[PDB]
Design goal:
Blueprint: H1 6-11
Length: 16
């Protein structure tokens, strides 16, 4: 399945 790096790859694109 997914949801492991998915939005994490869209997460890495953050401002944290």
């Amino acid at each position: 399945r997914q949801i492991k790096i998915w939005f994490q790859n869209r997460r890495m694109k953050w401002k944290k």
